Amino acid sequence: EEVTEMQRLVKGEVVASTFDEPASRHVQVAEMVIEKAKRLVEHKKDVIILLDSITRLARAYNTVVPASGKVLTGGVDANALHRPKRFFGAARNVEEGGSLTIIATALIDTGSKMDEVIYEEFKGTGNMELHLSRKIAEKRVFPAIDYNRSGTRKEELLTTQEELQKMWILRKIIHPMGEIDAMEFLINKLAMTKTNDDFFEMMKRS
Amino acid sequence: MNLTELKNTPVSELITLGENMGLENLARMRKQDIIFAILKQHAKSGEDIFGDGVLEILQDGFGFLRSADSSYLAGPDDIYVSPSQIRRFNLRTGDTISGKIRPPKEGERYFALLKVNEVNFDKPENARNKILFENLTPLHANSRLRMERDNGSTEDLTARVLDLASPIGRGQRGLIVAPPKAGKTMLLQNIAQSIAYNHPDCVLMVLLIDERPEEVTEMQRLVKGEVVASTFDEPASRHVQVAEMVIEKAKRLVEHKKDVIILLDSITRLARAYNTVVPASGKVLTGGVDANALHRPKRFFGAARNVEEGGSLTIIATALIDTGSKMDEVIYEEFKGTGNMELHLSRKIAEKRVFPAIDYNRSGTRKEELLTTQEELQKMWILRKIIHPMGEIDAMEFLINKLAMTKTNDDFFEMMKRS
Amino acid sequence: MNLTELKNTPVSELITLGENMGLENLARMRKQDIIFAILKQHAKSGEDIFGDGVLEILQDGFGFLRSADSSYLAGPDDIYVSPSQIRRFNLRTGDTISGKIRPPKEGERYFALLKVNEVNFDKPENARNKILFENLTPLHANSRLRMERDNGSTEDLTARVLDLASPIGRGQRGLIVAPPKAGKTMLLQNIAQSIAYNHPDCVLMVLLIDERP
Numbered sequence: 001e002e003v004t005e006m007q008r009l010v011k012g013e014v015v016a017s018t019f020d021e022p023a024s025r026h027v028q029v030a031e032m033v034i035e036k037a038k039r040l041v042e043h044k045k046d047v048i049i050l051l052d053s054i055t056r057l058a059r060a061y062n063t064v065v066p067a068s069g070k071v072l073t074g075g076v077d078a079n080a081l082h083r084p085k086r087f088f089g090a091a092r093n094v095e096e097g098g099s100l101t102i103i104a105t106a107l108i109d110t111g112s113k114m115d116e117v118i119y120e121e122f123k124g125t126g127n128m129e130l131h132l133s134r135k136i137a138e139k140r141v142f143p144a145i146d147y148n149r150s151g152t153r154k155e156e157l158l159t160t161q162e163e164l165q166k167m168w169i170l171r172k173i174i175h176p177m178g179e180i181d182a183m184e185f186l187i188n189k190l191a192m193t194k195t196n197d198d199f200f201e202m203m204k205r206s
Numbered sequence: 207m208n209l210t211e212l213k214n215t216p217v218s219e220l221i222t223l224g225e226n227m228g229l230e231n232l233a234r235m236r237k238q239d240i241i242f243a244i245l246k247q248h249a250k251s252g253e254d255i256f257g258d259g260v261l262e263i264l265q266d267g268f269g270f271l272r273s274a275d276s277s278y279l280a281g282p283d284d285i286y287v288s289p290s291q292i293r294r295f296n297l298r299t300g301d302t303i304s305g306k307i308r309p310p311k312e313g314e315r316y317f318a319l320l321k322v323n324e325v326n327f328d329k330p331e332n333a334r335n336k337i338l339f340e341n342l343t344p345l346h347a348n349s350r351l352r353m354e355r356d357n358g359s360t361e362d363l364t365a366r367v368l369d370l371a372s373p374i375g376r377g378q379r380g381l382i383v384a385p386p387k388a389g390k391t392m393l394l395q396n397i398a399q400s401i402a403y404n405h406p407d408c409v410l411m412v413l414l415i416d417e418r419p420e421e422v423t424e425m426q427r428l429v430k431g432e433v434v435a436s437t438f439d440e441p442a443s444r445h446v447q448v449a450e451m452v453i454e455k456a457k458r459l460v461e462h463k464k465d466v467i468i469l470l471d472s473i474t475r476l477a478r479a480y481n482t483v484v485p486a487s488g489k490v491l492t493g494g495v496d497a498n499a500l501h502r503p504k505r506f507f508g509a510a511r512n513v514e515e516g517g518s519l520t521i522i523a524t525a526l527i528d529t530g531s532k533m534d535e536v537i538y539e540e541f542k543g544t545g546n547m548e549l550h551l552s553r554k555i556a557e558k559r560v561f562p563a564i565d566y567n568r569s570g571t572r573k574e575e576l577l578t579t580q581e582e583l584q585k586m587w588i589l590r591k592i593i594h595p596m597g598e599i600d601a602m603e604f605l606i607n608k609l610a611m612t613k614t615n616d617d618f619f620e621m622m623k624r625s
Numbered sequence: 626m627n628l629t630e631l632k633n634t635p636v637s638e639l640i641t642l643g644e645n646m647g648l649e650n651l652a653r654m655r656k657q658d659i660i661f662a663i664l665k666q667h668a669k670s671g672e673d674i675f676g677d678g679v680l681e682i683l684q685d686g687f688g689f690l691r692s693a694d695s696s697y698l699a700g701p702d703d704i705y706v707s708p709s710q711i712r713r714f715n716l717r718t719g720d721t722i723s724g725k726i727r728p729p730k731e732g733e734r735y736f737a738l739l740k741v742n743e744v745n746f747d748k749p750e751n752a753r754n755k756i757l758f759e760n761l762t763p764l765h766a767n768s769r770l771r772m773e774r775d776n777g778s779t780e781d782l783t784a785r786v787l788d789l790a791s792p793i794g795r796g797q798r799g800l801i802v803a804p805p806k807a808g809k810t811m812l813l814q815n816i817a818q819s820i821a822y823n824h825p826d827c828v829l830m831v832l833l834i835d836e837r838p
């Protein structure tokens with residue numbers, strides 16, 4: 001059911017693998033997408049991949065890849081995680097032309113030992129971090145985003161000089177307060193502002 | 207239909223009103239819950255519901271419309287206003303907002319304001335252009351508030367003595383100093399009656415801090431104006447909240463060229479609440495009162511002034527002395543020369559069963575030339591010339607017999623010149 | 626254009642001035658905030674903005690230009706001066722600085738001083754060579770400050786009595802001893818009027834501590 005709504009909503013081609021399909025199918029789909037994405041990049045074209053989820057993808061690679069004699073914590077082989085890292089690490093900005101953007105979701109606090117060890121290997125491998133808080137979600141306040149923990153690296157290039165420094169003062173007043181009420185503070189402030197630009201000038205007012 | 211009259215109606219009428227609307231089990235609930243239940247049942251009928259209250263902006267951003275009937279106490283019937291209304295309608299704390307309200311939808315427990323059609327008893331558009339109270343230039347009192355009542359019986363001469371002791375005008379910042387059980391509670395009652403009778407136009411507000419529940423009821427039944435109070439059982443955080451609400455409301459009325467009189471009781475008790483709520487800053491003075499703790503009451507007390515542009519704010523407070531507490535006397539030291547009017551009551555006069563127990567020699571007012579006329583002012587000077595030599599205990603007794611035989615203070619003046 | 630006259634203008638004129646410039650919701654704000662809002666809107670127009678104030682060097686190193694209108698109270702409209710200006714222009718606390726100011730760039734909430742063209746009502750170069758007050762040799766008062774006013778009415782003889790009681794001269798360090806409610810408040814008023822009238826050249830400063838509004 002999740003696949004059908006994604007196809008009907010996303011304005012682009014969507015591929016998926018149901019749970020009933022074997023593990024060898026999940027790796028095949030992942031390999032096909034990344035290879036197709038790389039070819040488009042070679043033609044000076046921008047391709048964006050919304051991977052979901054990196055934790056589940058590593059499970060498929062662990063099952064299909066035979067054991068090499070070395071077993072880490074949780075039963076994940078070291079060589080097993082090599083393939084997802086290469087797939088995930090393919091995202092880059094090409095100087096010659098084009099780009100490849102990969103966004104993946106990592107599952108934590110799922111109650112499985114195998115899931116948390118995978119997240120450890122993918123901790124500092126991404127230049128952008130977006131952490132969602134469970135306790136914020138249960139408060140029925142959305143989006144449940146941990147503003148203090150979430151962030152991006154080397155954001156000077158993305159934003160302008162004025163816009164970048166406007167975010168710094170915003171983080172200066174969100175850091176002291178708790179993360180549970182930090183999102184609630186932004187929700188009401190963004191509700192009364194039509195655009196983010198109007199939100200910036202409102203913060204400077206007080 | 208309107209929330210204003212529902213609170214004024216007694217509980218017995220509310221029970222009868224609720225029963226015919228289909229409600230049950232209302233007698234055992236609080237009055238605030240009855241109002242909420244009645245409004246909820248009437249809300250689903252379809253008829254529009256109005257409301258009124260005093261805005262209280264919280265630190266989060268959203269405010270509430272407290273009611274003076276409940277002494278500005280938070281309750282289920284309080285009207286909730288989103289920050290959007292504060293944006294479109296520039297409003298501050300203490301503003302009076304009256305307008306239509308909507309029933310609370312599921313997921314909220316407070317009524318919401320639909321539209322605003324009356325701000326501070328004025329059109330909302332005009333209220334946005336009112337000058338802030340701080341920007342107003344203070345001035346000395348000019349017009350005197352007469353304290354002598356023609357209908358007043360000769361049994362109580364307190365009103366007449368106040369005129370001879372220390373006249374009061376609009377914007378005055380007088381302070382009352384009196385030991386416990388010196389008759390200060392009913393001293394303000396005589397002032398409240400005189401202000402209500404002689405000057406019905408002036409807005410009279412009575413503020414009571416840590417007062418007994420029985421004292422509150424008699425003040426409301428006697429004072430011809432809205433009276434707010436906080437009982438001793440209520441926490442310290444409630445006492446400061448009531449004081450902040452009154453002063454903010456008073457300032458807004460001043461901005462509309464309106465005269466408001468506040469009878470604070472008592473400044474000593476008010477400073478106790480501020481000392482408790484304000485965290486210690488590392489510096490402790492004598493008696494355990496922090497220096498920053500007393501900053502807030504001084505700003506509240508010092509707000510009394512006469513506005514050159516228009517309107518006035520008169521604050522009269524009672525200071526407790528000789529109460530046996532070290533913390534009480536140090537507070538009075540900070541408020542010694544901060545008032546332009548001094549009214550000292552003597553304990554030894556009170557125990558002699560002679561009232562009003564006013565120390566004429568110590569009591570007085572500063573810059574009384576503007577309040578009184580040229581003839582009246584100099585008539586008081588000769589009176590003080592013959593009261594100063596005699597003792598303060600017999601000074602009041604001298605005035606009591608002299609004022610008893612004179613119908614009005616004017617007749618008393620000519621009698622003194624006779625001898 | 627210049628911050629000096631904006632503070633002198635009443636609040637009513639400031640509201641009218643702000644409205645025609647496109648500002649809204651100014652009546653409910655403080656006078657200091659109105660000045661900052663008016664300057665900010667005028668700053669982005671492009672016209673140069675001047676300023677004046679009294680330097681207050683903090684312990685950190687940077688100072689501010691307080692205004693006598695606000696009784697030297699810290700406010701959003703105070704002009705911020707970096708320690709570099711104190712280096713190039715040797716300045717101390719209490720110096721009067723008047724010059725062009727720049728709009729505050731984002732990340733700062735205070736106006737900054739562009740250039741200095743008047744220090745202590747004098748050229749900045751000449752102010753650097755002034756001898757320090759401590760190095761000056763004190764002396765007894767020589768020239769007497771007359772207290773009797775010809776225009777003064779006979780109703781108030783306070784000015785005349787002061788001449789007979791104790792004459793005052795330039796550099797005098799007199800002290801007044803008086804119990805409360807002895808008429809000391811208006812006693813200084815007679816002195817202030819006499820000094821302003823008889824000696825308009827002398828700079829008169831009145832300092833009040835813990836006084837009623």
Ligand SMILES: Nc1ncnc2c1ncn2[C@@H]1O[C@H](COP(=O)(O)OP(=O)(O)O)[C@@H](O)[C@H]1O
Pocket residue numbers: 362363364385386387388389390391392393561562
């Ligand atoms: N003007 C007055 N005339 C007659 N009695 C007075 C007067 N003022 C005070 N009293 C006496 O004072 C008593 C009440 O004092 P109270 O106001 O409670 O003092 P406090 O407020 O300091 O406790 C009453 O019993 C009353 O007899």
Ligand SMILES: Nc1ncnc2c1ncn2[C@@H]1O[C@H](COP(=O)(O)OP(=O)(O)O)[C@@H](O)[C@H]1O
Pocket residue numbers: 572573574781782783804805806807808809810811812
């Ligand atoms: N030169 C004077 N002529 C007439 N009245 C005076 C004079 N000096 C003082 N007073 C009287 O003193 C009173 C004000 O005293 P004030 O200056 O407030 O004393 P303090 O400053 O010690 O409180 C006024 O009511 C005024 O009548």
Ligand SMILES: [Mg+2]
Pocket residue numbers: 390391
């Ligand atoms: Mg009492």
Ligand SMILES: [Mg+2]
Pocket residue numbers: 809810
């Ligand atoms: Mg004085």
